[PDB]
């Protein structure tokens, strides 16, 4: 009965393509002509964090815009104080390969995962005063690529066996599973209200999953290569994905199609991390040609450049008040760019 | 110097953490990383059993007289996007089986285990990250290949090959076909033929890693 099933599936995908061509009354680039250009964005490095002896893989800002976590290949999970360059914590890790790290919104727990297929959650406030293992989560058969804290109780994790999972840290079991991908799911980005989340994989398509219900709502396929990073827009209506074909694309949830494609003819390098600003006018993209670019999200023109690293930029983070931008790269330096007048 | 007492104590704690990280890096620096990338039917289980005497990455710590080797085993990855983590390894232990030219794949497509191994080795040699890294090739299961080669001629596996069914001749031809693949003068393929029961593998690995470290030192100093 596979023939009528494949024909029905092609008819449904034609119906969805027809609906997306019907909804496209006008583009975004046409209606932004009246809007004034942002202009030059002069940013300089304020602080430089040098506590790692190996390449840094990921980072995450705290909600107080004060502390930051960073994971390295040598097996260290260092929690920095970004203003006065003081090491607040240094967690020695069991597995040296750690590809992601997250900081709780309350500020109590720090998770980290990698090639060991186990998500290790550490507790920072104890009566002993020494950080220790608090929870170990092992229910995946692929490498753990990203994790983010919805709250202290529940953590959303993304693995390399084409799965995402909602975990309950107290009991230690999978609450619900998200199995809609066919490639390795590289990154996720939570909504601010923690209702939905987006997930980009290696099938060149991003999915919109629901936390509570646990079923995929929307599918976005406009990339010709693997998606590496994803960043949800602050108001709760759009998101942006970066891929290896030197393009990052801004997609809309309610329009159910892509809005804008940020690309450049001289750039032929991959995108490792994307992030928005506090208002959402500047799109920060960490390219593979040793420097980051500041794009204008409404005008689609290259506004600025952050060139301070010697090796490829692996991770990039913006605070909640949007005061400074921290960039980590494989040359073992965390550089905190900020802009003044 | 216009800092409070807590800030000074925090700076001293940061200096303590700096010294601890420095000592951990000095302990870590004296270790050699090896990548055991292989196929399922390769017989790499025999290799780790010979080196020694669990979904996550397996870690093996075996020490010779003066050098400590730390071997990493991964296991079911279609496109292996995690390969960038293993840039800093000094050598890749890449094992292929000699007995696999008969048995076809489970899919039953017109592909052979040897041809898949050649494609995988070609993908490793052409990889952007592995242009500097050298390969140590082990040809496992000599006994089974020696037995099977009398019954079956080496025609189905290599049509271009036109030679007599001799164990030494064909083994040399397979070694030449594997050495043909690289097009970079920086790396050298260290070929060695192994068996189910051997004890010289640790010696072979020690000599090859010693050669690779001396060659890396000479290339870093600008001499080689």
């Amino acid at each position, epitope marked *: 009965e596979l023939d009528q099933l494949r024909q029905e599936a092609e008819q449904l995908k034609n119906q969805i393509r027809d609906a997306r061509k019907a909804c496209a009354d006008a583009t975004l680039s046409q209606i932004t002509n009246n809007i004034d250009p942002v202009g030059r964005i002069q940013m300089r490095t304020r602080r430089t964090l040098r506590g790692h002896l190996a390449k840094i893989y990921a980072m995450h800002w705290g909600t107080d815009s004060r502390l930051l976590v960073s994971a390295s290949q040598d097996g260290k999970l260092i929690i920095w104080d970004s203003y006065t360059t003081n090491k607040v914590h240094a967690i020695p890790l069991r597995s040296s390969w750690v590809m992601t790290c997250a900081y709780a919104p309350s500020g109590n727990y720090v998770a980290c995962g990698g090639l060991d297929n186990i998500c290790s959650i550490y507790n920072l406030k104890t009566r*002993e005063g020494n950080v220790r293992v608090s929870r170990e989560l092992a229910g995946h058969t692929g490498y753990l690529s990203c994790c983010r804290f919805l709250d202290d109780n529940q953590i959303v994790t993304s693995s390399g066996d084409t799965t995402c999972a909602l975990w309950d840290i107290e009991t230690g079991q999978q609450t619900t599973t998200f199995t809609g991908h066919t490639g390795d799911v590289m990154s996720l980005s939570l909504a601010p209200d923690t209702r939905l989340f987006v997930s980009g994989a290696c099938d060149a398509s991003a999915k919109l999953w629901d936390v509570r219900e646990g079923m995929c709502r929307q599918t976005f396929t406009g990339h010709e290569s693997d998606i590496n990073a994803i960043c949800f827009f602050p108001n709760g209506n759009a998101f942006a994905t970066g891929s290896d074909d030197a393009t990052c694309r801004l997609f809309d949830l309610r329009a159910d199609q892509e809005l804008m494609t940020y690309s450049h003819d001289n750039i032929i390098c991959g995108i490792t991390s994307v992030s928005f600003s506090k208002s959402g006018r500047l799109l920060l993209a960490g390219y593979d040609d040793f420097n980051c670019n500041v794009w204008d999200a409404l005008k689609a023109d290259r506004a600025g450049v952050l060139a301070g690293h010697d090796n490829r930029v692996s991770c990039l983070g913006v605070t909640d008040d949007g005061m400074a931008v921290a960039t980590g790269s494989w040359d073992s330096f965390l550089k905190i760019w900020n802009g003044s007048s | 110097c216009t800092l409070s007492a807590e800030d000074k104590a925090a700076v001293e704690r940061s200096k303590m953490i700096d010294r601890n990280l420095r000592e951990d890096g000095e302990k870590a620096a004296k270790d050699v990383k090896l990548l055991l990338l292989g196929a399922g039917e390769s017989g790499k289980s025999t290799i780790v059993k010979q080196m020694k005497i669990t979904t996550g990455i397996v870690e093996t710590h075996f020490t010779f007289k003066n050098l400590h080797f730390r071997l990493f085993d991964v296991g079911r990855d279609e496109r292996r996007k995690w390969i960038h983590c293993f840039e800093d390894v000094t050598a890749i232990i890449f094992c292929v089986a000699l007995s696999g030219y008969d048995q076809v794949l489970h899919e039953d497509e017109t592909t052979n285990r040897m041809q898949e191994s050649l494609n995988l080795f070609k993908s490793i040699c052409n990889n952007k990250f592995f242009i500097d890294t050298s390969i140590i090739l082990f040809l496992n299961k000599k006994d089974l290949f020696g037995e099977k080669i009398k019954k079956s001629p080496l025609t189905i596996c290599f049509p271009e090959y036109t030679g007599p069914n001799t164990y030494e001749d064909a083994a040399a031809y397979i070694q030449a076909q594997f050495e043909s693949k690289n097009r970079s003068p920086n790396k050298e393929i260290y070929c060695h033929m192994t068996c189910s029961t051997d004890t010289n593998n640790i010696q072979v690995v020690f000599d090859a890693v010693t050669d690779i470290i001396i060659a890396n030192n000479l290339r870093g100093c600008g001499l080689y």
Partner: single-chain antibody
Amino acid sequence: VQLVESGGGLVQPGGSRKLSCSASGFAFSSFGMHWVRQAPEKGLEWVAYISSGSGTIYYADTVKGRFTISRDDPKNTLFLQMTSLRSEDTAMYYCVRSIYYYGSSPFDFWGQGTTLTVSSADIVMTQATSSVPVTPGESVSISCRSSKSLLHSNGNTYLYWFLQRPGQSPQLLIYRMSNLASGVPDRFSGSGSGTAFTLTISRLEAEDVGVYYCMQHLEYPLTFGAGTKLEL
């Protein structure tokens, strides 16, 4: 977490005494260590501090040159060699652990105490009210005052509020005048200007009877409050 003091007794003047502090149940080597002395009818008085890793040592002015603090990290033990003991040294000696980083809670654990019985530029801390008779269910507001402004340029105000219950160890209540200590119920609160501070109790209970101390932690040597006892 356990700190056990030993080495006390009754001595003649001029004699020496090696005090020990036995630590268990925590990471001793990551914590700086404090000796604090309380006289029988007087308030708490700081003695000494040794940093984690023994790199940095601080003594009081009166105490300087006669007492030697040291620590043995593998044995998890704090030592205090005392020489030239005068009559003023007769006191209850407390061993204290303290860690200093952003967000930490220093002075969060107080020892049991050992008994010794012998036969200008410094910031002055002033609690002009020595005692207040209280009744349960009311709301209390006790004040403290410092001779120097305790607001630092980084925004922190280094003021700590302690409770010493009668016949028990001191207990931390408020650290840095804006943070509630671990295990303390949320009925306590702190509020102050640069020079005048106020600890406010809402719906005082039975266990709130004791002596309240204020403390500046702006600069060494540490100087403590005179103490405010709550009468029933």
